[PDB]
Design a protein around this ligand. Sequence first.
Ligand SMILES: [Mg+2]
Length: 517
Amino acid sequence: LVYDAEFVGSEREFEEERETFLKGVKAYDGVLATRYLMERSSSAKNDEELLELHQNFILLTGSYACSIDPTEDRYQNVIVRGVNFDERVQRLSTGGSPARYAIVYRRGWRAIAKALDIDEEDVPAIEVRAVKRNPLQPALYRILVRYGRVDLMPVTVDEVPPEMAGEFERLIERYDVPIDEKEERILEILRENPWTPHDEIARRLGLSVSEVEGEKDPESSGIYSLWSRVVVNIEYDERTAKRHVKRRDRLLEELYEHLEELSERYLRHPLTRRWIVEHKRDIMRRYLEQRIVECALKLQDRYGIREDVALCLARAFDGSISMIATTPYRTLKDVCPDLTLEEAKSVNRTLATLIDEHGLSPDAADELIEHFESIAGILATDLEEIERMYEEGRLSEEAYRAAVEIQLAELTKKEGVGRKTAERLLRAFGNPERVKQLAREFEIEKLASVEGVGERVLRSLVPGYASLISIRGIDRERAERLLKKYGGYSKVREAGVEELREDGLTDAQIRELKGLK
Ligand SMILES: [Mg+2]
């Protein structure tokens, strides 16, 4: 399977990138070693000092990762398990760095280390996927990395805000971000336990992981998309970024000296970097071991997969069910030759949907899985982009038509939207997710500017709009202004009488609004 990329900036920019990656490797090494130490004894395991050290390594790995490709243009032809990542990120509305996009995937460092000439023998791993012991809300942590948020990644555990962890919804509320109905289902689970694994959330909501996760772009649906919506609204703080970068190298050194000192409790020979290098492969295996077992068990018990295949797929994707669920049938078969199509459809539900619902050959479904990852990845892509790929010759007729039908149905599903209106909405606004974003933000006039989008379509698409506009003498202009002012319908309805009067409502209208009389 191909992992590759090339360096495309200046010599200066090259030396910078190299230094950063190696500092990130150094930090990831501390993640692995402390985890190794935590499993080495059981007094170790309940050692709060040891857990904080392990969390400080996670933050510093996070921080260094955030610093990759600061100009978003230093890397090209980023390929990860055969997938072109340049194309993947450029099709998202916010674009961004394809190298950091890569890093947020298991094994994504292999591509990036190659661009930078770091010997495979060094095993220069960086991973930023920690869930259970992550000091940050995990989806957020990955989103900070994706977006290169050196300003936002805390550089010490004592410095993590509660709004980035146990009180993470404060951050969402702070930037007034609209949340879809699916996302509110997600949030009910997350409020209770911010560190709930994504596959557990999916299980409880009866959804796939890709449905829960969404694309790492504002114009999607699910936790990644929600966080991306928050993060791109937080203006970059250059000074804080500089302070973090300025502190972090010394912090890393102190972590190592703490590591060595702490380890004199649970080992016989001290734990140095030299011991890391020597034992690197073993500690990488110890790190993954429980993930792999858990994934295998699930694939067998939850998706009916044969026991030998279950285990073969777990090891191949480092225990990540979410990844297996978004890998082309041909990539799955590549790494695990005994796998059947039926088993592949069982765990890859985009695959099963495309084949069963849309009449695609495994091969034509794989085109879409390769290019878009999932049904959610298709919904997040501009129709014109998909069309262009089919013009270019890079997407079969059959794959293109299913994509269009998938996009149209996300709209025709709503009362009053026919195929043509739906096609017009996609030409005007890009994709179905962007249409729903505009509706969540009450952009009634903008939405009504497209031919075919009268009162009916608005009533189905815009939440609260139907409720407000049925109050007599409130008009489309005022509904929009009201919905934007208070933040939605419940909030217009609970407004104070006096402030509603200054909005121009009569007492008869407020009375009716409030359900009085
Ligand atoms: Mg757009």
